[PDB]
Amino acid sequence: PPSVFAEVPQAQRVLVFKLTADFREDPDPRKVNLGVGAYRTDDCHPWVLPVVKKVEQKIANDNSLNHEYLPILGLAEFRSCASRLALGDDSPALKEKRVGGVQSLGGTGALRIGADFLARWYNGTNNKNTPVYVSSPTWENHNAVFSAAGFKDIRSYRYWDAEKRGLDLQGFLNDLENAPEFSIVVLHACAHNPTGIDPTPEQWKQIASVMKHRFLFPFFDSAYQGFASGNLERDAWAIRYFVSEGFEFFCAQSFSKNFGLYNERVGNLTVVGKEPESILQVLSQMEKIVRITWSNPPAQGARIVASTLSNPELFEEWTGNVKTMADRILTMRSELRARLEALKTPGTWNHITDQIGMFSFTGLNPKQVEYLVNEKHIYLLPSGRINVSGLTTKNLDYVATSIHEAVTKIQ
Ligand X SMILES: Cc1ncc(COP(=O)(O)O)c(C=O)c1O
328 binds, among ligand X, a copy of itself, none (CB under 5 to 8 A by kind): none
- Binding to a copy of itself by residue 275, rule CB under 8 A? yes
Q: Determine how β-strand 166-167 pairs with β-strand 184-188.
A: unpaired
**Nearest one of 352, 367, 399 to 35, comparing CA atoms:** 399
**Given 160, 168, 257, 376, the catalytic residue:** 257
For the question of residue 221 being annotated catalytic, the response is: yes
Triad 299, 321, 108: Cα angle to 5°: 45
Q: Is 37 within any annotated ligand binding site?
A: yes
CA distance 22 to 389: 19
Stretch that binds a copy of itself, among 226-234, 261-269, 339-347, 399-407 (CB under 8 A): 261-269
* Residue nearest ligand X (C-beta atom): 106
Q: Which residues, numbered 125-144, are part of the site for a copy of itself (CB under 8 A)? A: 141, 144
Please say whether the beta carbons of 172 and 209 come within 8 A: no
For the question of residue 237 being annotated catalytic, the response is: no
Question: How would you classify residue 265: left for phi > 0, otherwise alpha for psi between -120 and 50, otherwise beta?
Answer: left
Closer to a copy of itself by Cβ: residue 279 or 369 = 279
Q: Which residues, numbered 125-144, are part of the site for ligand X (CB under 6 A)? A: 139
**Given 139, 160, 204, 318, the catalytic residue:** 139
Stretch that binds ligand X, among 165-173, 243-251, 254-262, 375-383 (CB under 6 A): 254-262
221 binds, among a copy of itself, ligand X, none (CB under 5 to 8 A by kind): ligand X
- Binding to ligand X by residue 223, rule CB under 6 A? yes
Runs of H (alpha helix) within 46-150: 50-60, 76-87, 92-95, 106-121, 141-148
Closer to ligand X by Cβ: residue 223 or 304 = 223
Closer to ligand X by Cβ: residue 188 or 351 = 188
Stretch that binds a copy of itself, among 4-12, 222-230, 377-385, 391-399 (CB under 8 A): 4-12
Q: Which residues, numbered 51-110, are part of the site for a copy of itself (CB under 8 A)? A: 52, 56-57, 59-61, 65-70, 105-106, 108-109
Q: Determine how β-strand 166-167 pairs with β-strand 160-161.
A: antiparallel
Q: Which residues, numbered 288-307, are part of the site for ligand X (CB under 6 A)? A: 295
For the question of residue 349 being annotated catalytic, the response is: no
CA distance 368 to 366: 5
Please say whether the beta carbons of 368 and 406 come within 8 A: yes
Closer to a copy of itself by Cβ: residue 56 or 370 = 56
CA distance 236 to 85: 9
Q: Is 84 within any annotated ligand binding site?
A: no
**Residue 231 phi, psi (nearest 5):** -125, 105
* Secondary structure percentages of the chain, helix, strand, coil, to 5: 45, 15, 40
Instruction: Write the DSSP assignment of 163-183 as a string of letters.
Output: TTTEE-HHHHHHHHHTSPTT-
Q: Which of 170, 178, 293, 393 binds a copy of itself (CB under 8 A)?
A: 293
Interface positions with ligand X (CB under 6 A): 106-108, 139, 188, 193, 221, 223, 254, 256-257, 267, 295
